[PDB]
């Protein structure tokens, strides 16, 4: 129930505003900046502000905060979803989200803002569908919005029918300073770039544990996804009935399904780091990385971030494999490794100075984060079984998919 | 299939060596297609096994079946899920249509001794599907 959607800037100037109900005066945006400054300076700053009887719930973008004023008991979740959809639409239309396009793409921005939401109730959010009715360089609105299928424009024709899939893995590990892993969750991501002719009805089929149990094959390697979130094209009823993943793929790259299940296996990389920090004299970093992953897999672009002292200067690194550099902007040791074969063991011996004068205030212990990304490795063991591409005209599809394993929330708590 | 013929003797020897009763990860061959075994492919594999021998009359074991499924997946890219048998006690029919292999008693279904027996009627009659319509959907 947003009253006026406005786009602010880093200096407090509203780049663009679009009132939806008009029940809130446009002058309330001026008090948002002082209120945000007071909240940030007192630790009470939150994305949902409140100027008396008017609430300013908005998120911070790359360069400006998309603040949407509201006065009644509007749905905060609905406002957040609308803001996320607007951000996605802006990213799809404009390659950059900065003030350079706000003051240059106002002609199409105003039209998009007017068409997207009316009276505070959004109606269209598909960038691909919206690109056929509002352009910055107008015909009747497409029937896709009026029809049930609002995410697949009819009449799409291509020379070839190739669909590229991406089974991206997110290895998130929360290892405490005692050496035990607390939060170890792996979230699957099935992102597909469907490029076919017509409006095919994809029938996704994988070796799901539930599907195998229902079919009676609950004895082989089956993926046990605790949470499975299908896209808008995926029919919820079909999945709820008999685990049938039937949906119309969109034209382009989109997230069809996103599995999310816990992981009870050992970490693919084991980091043994020590801190021999002398009292204002020197420091030692006996960091040893052990790869627990399969030897057939190589972790391309391994970046184990080791937080070094903030005031440390004149550091020396005695490592074994990979380039180690200290970035003063981040104040940490970047253990950058290009290719890390599975089972490899890298040992490092850091040595940096420390000023005699102690710091005025404590700086904390940032967690050690690894940036391992090993492609062609499915840690969860989930493999795509089939993809039923059916078209009324009739064509031979050539679906493709790749498995990518990377490190997600793989942070290591410091001692 | 020269590769299949070469792997058949080694697979049979490994199955015979294993009695009837270390590396982590799931590596995937780059560009190797992976899909469930087809009915025609299953029938061809059953015919090849019957012609070459070593599978008909062999004592059914979990280790031998797993080794055979792994070898089939390595040599053909077929998922090791179509080599499923119907629950006992008694004769277990193949779960995948087209398979000519079945398990029959040789003497709780788990402790019953079962051996692989060729059955050409499996590729034409869906015995497993008829017995378990719910499992076939």
């Amino acid at each position: 129930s947003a009253s006026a959607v406005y786009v602010l800037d880093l200096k407090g100037k509203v780049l663009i505003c679009r009132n939806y109900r008009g029940d809130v005066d446009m002058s309330e945006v001026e008090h948002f900046m002082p209120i945000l400054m007071e909240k940030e300076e007192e630790g009470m700053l939150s994305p949902i502000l409140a100027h008396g009887g008017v609430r300013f719930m908005w998120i911070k973008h790359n360069n400006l905060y998309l603040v949407a004023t509201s006065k009644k008991n509007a749905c905060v979740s609905l406002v957040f979803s609308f803001l996320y959809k607007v951000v996605q639409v802006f990213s799809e239309y404009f390659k950059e989200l900065e003030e350079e396009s706000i003051r240059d793409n106002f002609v199409i921005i105003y039209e998009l803002l007017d068409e997207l939401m009316d009276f505070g109730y959004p109606q269209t959010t598909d960038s691909k569908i919206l690109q056929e009715y509002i352009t910055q360089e107008a015909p009747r609105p497409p029937a896709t919005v009026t029809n049930a299928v609002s995410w697949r424009s009819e009449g799409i024709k291509y020379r070839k029918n190739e669909v590229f899939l991406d089974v991206i893995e997110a290895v998130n590990l929360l290892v405490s300073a005692n050496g035990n892993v607390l939060r170890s969750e792996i979230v699957g991501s099935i992102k597909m770039r469907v490029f076919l002719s017509g409006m095919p009805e994809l029938r996704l089929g994988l070796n799901d544990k539930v599907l195998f149990d229902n079919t009676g094959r609950g004895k082989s390697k089956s993926v046990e996804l605790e949470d499975v979130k299908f896209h808008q094209c995926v029919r919820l009823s079909r999945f709820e009935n008999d685990r049938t993943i039937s949906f119309i793929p969109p034209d382009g790259e989109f997230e069809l399904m996103s599995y999310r299940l816990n992981t009870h296996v050992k970490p693919l990389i084991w980091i043994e780091s020590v801190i021999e920090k002398h009292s204002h004299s020197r420091i030692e970093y006996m960091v040893k990385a052990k790869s627990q992953f399969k030897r057939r897999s190589t972790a391309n672009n391994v970046e184990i971030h080791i937080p070094v002292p903030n005031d440390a200067d004149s550091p020396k690194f005695k490592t074994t494999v990979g380039s180690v550099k200290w970035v003063p902007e981040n104040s940490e040791i970047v253990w950058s490794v290009k290719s890390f074969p599975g089972g490899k063991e890298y040992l490092m011996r850091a040595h940096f100075g420390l000023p005699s004068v102690e710091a005025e205030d404590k700086e904390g212990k940032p967690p050690i984060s690894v940036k391992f990304e090993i492609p062609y490795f499915t840690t969860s063991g989930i493999q795509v079984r089939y993809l039923k591409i059916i078209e009324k005209s009739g064509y031979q599809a050539l679906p493709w998919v790749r498995y990518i394993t990377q490190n997600g929330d793989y942070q290591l708590r410091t001692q | 299939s020269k590769s299949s013929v070469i792997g058949w003797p080694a697979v049979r020897e490994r199955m015979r060596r294993a009695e009837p009763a270390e590396e982590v990860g799931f590596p995937v061959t780059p560009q190797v297609p992976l899909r469930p075994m087809t009915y025609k492919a299953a029938v061809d594999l059953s015919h090849f096994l019957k012609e070459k021998g070593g599978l008909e009359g062999l004592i059914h074991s979990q280790r031998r079946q797993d080794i055979l499924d792994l070898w089939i997946y390595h040599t053909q890219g077929y998922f090791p899920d179509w080599q499923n048998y119907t629950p006992g006690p008694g004769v277990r029919y193949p779960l995948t249509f087209g398979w000519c292999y079945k398990l029959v008693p040789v003497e709780d279904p788990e402790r019953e001794v079962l051996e692989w027996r060729f059955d050409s009627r499996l590729a034409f009659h869906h015995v497993a599907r008829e017995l378990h319509p719910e499992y076939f959907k």
Binding site: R402 | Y39, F79
Partner: peptide
């Protein structure tokens, strides 16, 4: 080639499940 694992062709359905 492509970083992050080479793309592999996908099947049409569970051929072993009819």
């Amino acid at each position: 080639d492509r970083k992050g694992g080479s793309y592999s062709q996908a099947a049409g359905s569970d051929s072993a499940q009819s």
